[PDB]
Design a protein around this ligand. Structure first.
Ligand code: SF4
Ligand code: SF4
Ligand code: FES
Ligand SMILES: [K+]
Lengths: 55, 230
């Protein structure tokens, strides 16, 4: 992504495909390494009524 | 022949008169869950775990204290028997303290085993549990009364086999504690056997306390040589 325009032109001519639009080196488009804390949902049997184990 | 025939799960069996439901169910090779019944102690009938259903009878009977009669059919795997077992397990685990990692009964606990086998998988008790003051009854039996379930095998063992008559049940309601009401040092020739008959970790062996765990112990049978009883 930091490659120069003549190197990009030679690279695109030699490959035959546009390589800058699909770069294999990861950049700032990735998700951040820190996240807000999550709150997980509960299962279908997290109930206080008609939750007998024999059913 | 005075013996009568009863039915368990649609199967006939021949039992003696005066034989309870639990003895017949053990005769057909099944184990009804229990906390207070003992084959060497008197019947108390208070833990209510042994509740089963006789067919054509809309009330569960206690299998540890109900004599059988001719023509009775006993359903030990019906829906209401499992509902009663789950309810009794939930009531027992309502006030039980979260002490399983620091309790010597872990790995050989009756309460944990039958909670896995017959109880539910979650607790609906959102309130605060009770707390019972501890007691000091000697240098052999480590006592933590918070984990007791009031099964009263202490009382029957102390009053029938040891015959010391020191243990008792003080107080009324949920605040009733199994103790001696005073700083009484319970010492006898058969004291440590109460550690055998406690289904919970309320009474533990003081020298053995916090030393090992039953799942990593190899069992080797042997004979006692300290006394000539063998
Ligand atoms: S006696 Fe109570 S604390 Fe100890 S292992 Fe059993 S359930 Fe857990
Ligand atoms: S301390 Fe153990 S044996 Fe004694 S009454 Fe309580 S549960 Fe039963
Ligand atoms: S085993 Fe029958 S009530 Fe406890
Ligand atoms: K015990």
């Amino acid at each position: 992504a930091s490659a120069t325009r003549l190197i990009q032109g030679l690279r695109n001519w030699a490959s035959g495909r546009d390589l800058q639009a699909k770069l294999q080196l990861r950049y700032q488009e990735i998700s951040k390494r820190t996240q807000p804390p999550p709150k997980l949902p509960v299962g279908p049997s997290h109930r206080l009524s008609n939750n007998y184990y024999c059913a | 022949s005075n013996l009568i025939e009863v039915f368990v799960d649609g199967q006939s069996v021949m039992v003696e008169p005066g034989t309870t439901v639990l003895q017949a169910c053990e005769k057909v090779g099944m184990q009804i869950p229990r906390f207070c019944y003992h084959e060497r102690l008197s019947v108390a009938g208070n833990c209510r775990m042994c509740l089963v259903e006789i067919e054509k009878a809309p009330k569960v009977v206690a299998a540890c204290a109900m004599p059988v009669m001719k023509g009775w059919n006993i359903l030990t795997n019906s829906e209401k028997t499992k509902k009663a077992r789950e309810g009794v397990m939930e009531f027992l685990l309502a006030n039980h303290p979260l002490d399983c990692p620091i309790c010597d009964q872990g790995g050989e606990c009756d309460l944990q085993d039958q909670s896995m086998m017959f109880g539910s998988d979650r607790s609906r008790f959102l309130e605060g549990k009770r707390a019972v003051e501890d007691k000091n009854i000697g240098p052999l039996v480590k006592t933590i009364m918070t984990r007791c379930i009031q099964c009263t095998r202490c009382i029957r063992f102390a009053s029938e086999i040891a015959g010391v008559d020191d243990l008792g049940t003080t107080g009324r309601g949920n605040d009733m504690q199994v103790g001696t009401y005073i700083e009484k040092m319970f010492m006898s020739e058969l004291s440590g056997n109460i550690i055998d008959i406690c289904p919970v970790g309320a009474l533990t062996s003081k020298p053995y306390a916090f030393t090992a765990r039953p799942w990593e112990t190899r069992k080797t049978e042997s004979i006692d040589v300290m006394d000539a009883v063998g």
